Scaffold this motif. Structure first.
Motif, PDB file in Angstrom:
ATOM      1  N   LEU A   9       0.873  -1.083   0.002  1.00 17.79           N
ATOM      2  CA  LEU A   9       0.046  -0.108  -0.089  1.00 17.79           C
ATOM      3  C   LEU A   9       0.861   1.207  -0.060  1.00 17.79           C
ATOM      4  CD1 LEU A   9      -2.835   0.678   2.271  1.00 17.79           C
ATOM      5  CD2 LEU A   9      -1.493   2.340   1.629  1.00 17.79           C
ATOM      6  N   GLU A  10       1.830   1.198   0.789  1.00 20.30           N
ATOM      7  CA  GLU A  10       2.728   2.157   1.168  1.00 20.30           C
ATOM      8  C   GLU A  10       3.626   2.398  -0.307  1.00 20.30           C
ATOM      9  OE1 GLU A  10       3.245   5.108   3.256  1.00 20.30           O
ATOM     10  OE2 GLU A  10       1.164   4.201   3.387  1.00 20.30           O
ATOM     11  N   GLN A  11       4.191   1.396  -0.986  1.00 17.73           N
ATOM     12  CA  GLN A  11       4.738   1.521  -2.311  1.00 17.73           C
ATOM     13  C   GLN A  11       3.933   2.171  -3.176  1.00 17.73           C
ATOM     14  OE1 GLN A  11       6.379  -2.462  -3.623  1.00 17.73           O
ATOM     15  NE2 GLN A  11       7.140  -2.994  -1.600  1.00 17.73           N
ATOM     16  N   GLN A  12       2.568   1.691  -3.254  1.00 13.27           N
ATOM     17  CA  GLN A  12       1.706   2.479  -4.278  1.00 13.27           C
ATOM     18  C   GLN A  12       1.373   3.874  -3.907  1.00 13.27           C
ATOM     19  OE1 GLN A  12      -2.007   0.106  -4.395  1.00 13.27           O
ATOM     20  NE2 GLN A  12      -0.859  -1.739  -4.799  1.00 13.27           N
ATOM     21  N   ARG A  13       1.243   4.119  -2.591  1.00 16.83           N
ATOM     22  CA  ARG A  13       1.017   5.581  -2.307  1.00 16.83           C
ATOM     23  C   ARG A  13       2.202   6.565  -2.517  1.00 16.83           C
ATOM     24  NH1 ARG A  13       1.082   9.131   1.912  1.00 16.83           N
ATOM     25  NH2 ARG A  13       2.299   7.584   3.254  1.00 16.83           N
ATOM     26  N   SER A  14       3.410   5.893  -2.607  1.00 17.33           N
ATOM     27  CA  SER A  14       4.679   6.620  -3.008  1.00 17.33           C
ATOM     28  C   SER A  14       4.731   7.276  -4.356  1.00 17.33           C
ATOM     29  CB  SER A  14       5.839   6.107  -2.505  1.00 17.33           C
ATOM     30  OG  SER A  14       6.145   4.895  -3.288  1.00 17.33           O
ATOM     31  N   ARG A  15       4.186   6.318  -5.443  1.00 16.19           N
ATOM     32  CA  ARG A  15       4.051   6.681  -6.751  1.00 16.19           C
ATOM     33  C   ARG A  15       2.815   7.300  -7.118  1.00 16.19           C
ATOM     34  NH1 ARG A  15       6.681   3.107 -10.365  1.00 16.19           N
ATOM     35  NH2 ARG A  15       6.323   4.943 -11.725  1.00 16.19           N
ATOM     36  N   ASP A  16       1.756   7.358  -6.240  1.00 17.47           N
ATOM     37  CA  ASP A  16       0.388   7.895  -6.516  1.00 17.47           C
ATOM     38  C   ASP A  16      -0.282   8.480  -5.296  1.00 17.47           C
ATOM     39  OD1 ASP A  16      -1.875   8.401  -7.178  1.00 17.47           O
ATOM     40  OD2 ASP A  16      -2.937   6.556  -7.399  1.00 17.47           O
ATOM     41  N   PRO A  17       0.192   9.955  -5.135  1.00 17.70           N
ATOM     42  CA  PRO A  17      -0.493  10.608  -3.804  1.00 17.70           C
ATOM     43  C   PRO A  17      -1.768  10.543  -3.583  1.00 17.70           C
ATOM     44  CG  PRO A  17       1.346  11.692  -4.916  1.00 17.70           C
ATOM     45  CD  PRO A  17       0.828  10.558  -5.915  1.00 17.70           C
ATOM     46  N   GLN A  18      -2.448  10.192  -4.673  1.00 21.26           N
ATOM     47  CA  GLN A  18      -3.869  10.181  -4.422  1.00 21.26           C
ATOM     48  C   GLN A  18      -4.337   8.746  -4.343  1.00 21.26           C
ATOM     49  OE1 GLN A  18      -5.707  14.150  -6.522  1.00 21.26           O
ATOM     50  NE2 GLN A  18      -4.343  12.624  -8.243  1.00 21.26           N
ATOM     51  N   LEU A  19      -3.766   7.913  -4.134  1.00 22.76           N
ATOM     52  CA  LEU A  19      -4.290   6.235  -4.328  1.00 22.76           C
ATOM     53  C   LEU A  19      -5.531   6.327  -3.415  1.00 22.76           C
ATOM     54  CD1 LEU A  19      -3.094   3.404  -4.825  1.00 22.76           C
ATOM     55  CD2 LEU A  19      -2.459   3.345  -2.513  1.00 22.76           C
ATOM     56  N   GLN A  20      -6.295   5.648  -4.205  1.00 25.64           N
ATOM     57  CA  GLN A  20      -7.680   5.064  -3.269  1.00 25.64           C
ATOM     58  C   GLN A  20      -7.509   3.699  -2.792  1.00 25.64           C
ATOM     59  OE1 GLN A  20     -11.524   6.532  -4.982  1.00 25.64           O
ATOM     60  NE2 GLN A  20     -10.242   7.081  -6.500  1.00 25.64           N
ATOM     61  N   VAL A  21      -7.392   3.482  -1.482  1.00 23.61           N
ATOM     62  CA  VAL A  21      -7.619   2.218  -1.043  1.00 23.61           C
ATOM     63  C   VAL A  21      -9.012   1.881  -0.778  1.00 23.61           C
ATOM     64  CG1 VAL A  21      -7.013   0.663   0.871  1.00 23.61           C
ATOM     65  CG2 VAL A  21      -5.601   2.509   0.277  1.00 23.61           C
ATOM     66  N   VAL A  22      -9.586   0.670  -1.603  1.00 25.79           N
ATOM     67  CA  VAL A  22     -11.000   0.376  -1.695  1.00 25.79           C
ATOM     68  C   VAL A  22     -11.280  -0.507  -0.650  1.00 25.79           C
ATOM     69  CG1 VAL A  22     -12.942  -0.659  -3.117  1.00 25.79           C
ATOM     70  CG2 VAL A  22     -11.015   0.731  -4.222  1.00 25.79           C
ATOM     71  N   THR A  23     -10.149  -1.746  -0.460  1.00 23.49           N
ATOM     72  CA  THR A  23     -10.252  -2.695   0.413  1.00 23.49           C
ATOM     73  C   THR A  23      -8.866  -2.953   1.090  1.00 23.49           C
ATOM     74  OG1 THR A  23     -12.094  -3.991  -0.679  1.00 23.49           O
ATOM     75  CG2 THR A  23     -10.571  -5.453   0.279  1.00 23.49           C
TER      76      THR A  23
END
Lengths: 148, 148
Positions: free
Chosen positions: A67-81
């Motif tokens: 999740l943190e790897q994803q958020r480092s690339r995308d500061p608007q990451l949506q976590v659905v589940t």
């Protein structure tokens, strides 16, 4: 911008890719033993299955790292589940997210498990132009999972 | 419509995918020894590198088979490039195409080679919403290739 040069075939083959493109194995630092890739003809709908060595790190902790790897690339990451799921005695962890990069948007569904003393990772990525349709398709794939 | 059930981890893991999603290894019937996957965060930009056993089948013939596989899924397939390229004594074959399925469009650049008595396949797939930009990006990747 290109990334670092990539060397394959024990150094016999080398090339460079756009910097945003990275190795899809070893994202958790575990050594991948097996990888399988399924995709539609365009490659835009894909399931990557990786089987690697086990780790002592708990599955919710691994999920949080992805999740943190994803958020480092995308500061608007949506976590659905981001939750535990039960498959016949096995706890798996499921992380679903909406990932955006450079005007591409994907629905990503990742399932992690510890199966037969191995780290199992299944990553579903689907175009999220229709966010509800992508979510449904990913959930439908996950519903089919069986561990024997 | 789902496809045939998929069995992995020597039958321990099974699931089903949308019928349009297929195994990306073994498309030429050759057994894949090594596979590497590079992608952007959304998975929509991807390079898959497969190294398998050699075949007696000529590289232009393999390329023509991949082209025909693509055309069976997409009756409006665009062939952009289907040609030999020279890398330091090695003839490689390059097949570039614009592939459409279900409102997804990709630019696909495939390079085939026979290197160190192995079939090398490199498949680049990129969103082709901007067809010229996707083509440029694929060509730029291919330009970086070096065989030592």
């Amino acid at each position: 911008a290109s990334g670092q040069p990539i060397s394959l075939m024990d150094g016999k083959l080398s090339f460079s890719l756009p910097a945003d493109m990275t190795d899809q194995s070893g994202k958790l630092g575990t050594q991948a033993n097996n990888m399988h890739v399924y995709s539609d003809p365009t490659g835009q709908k894909a399931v990557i299955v990786i089987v690697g060595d086990n780790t002592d790190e708990a599955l919710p902790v691994l999920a949080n790292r992805l999740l943190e790897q994803q958020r480092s690339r995308d500061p608007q990451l949506q976590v659905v589940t981001n939750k535990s799921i039960e498959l016949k005695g096995h706890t798996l962890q499921q992380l679903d997210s909406i990932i955006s990069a450079k005007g591409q948007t994907a629905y990503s569904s990742i399932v992690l498990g510890k199966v037969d003393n191995q780290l199992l990772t299944i990553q579903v990525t689907l175009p999220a132009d229709n966010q509800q349709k992508a979510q449904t398709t990913a959930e439908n794939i996950i519903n089919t999972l069986v561990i024997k």
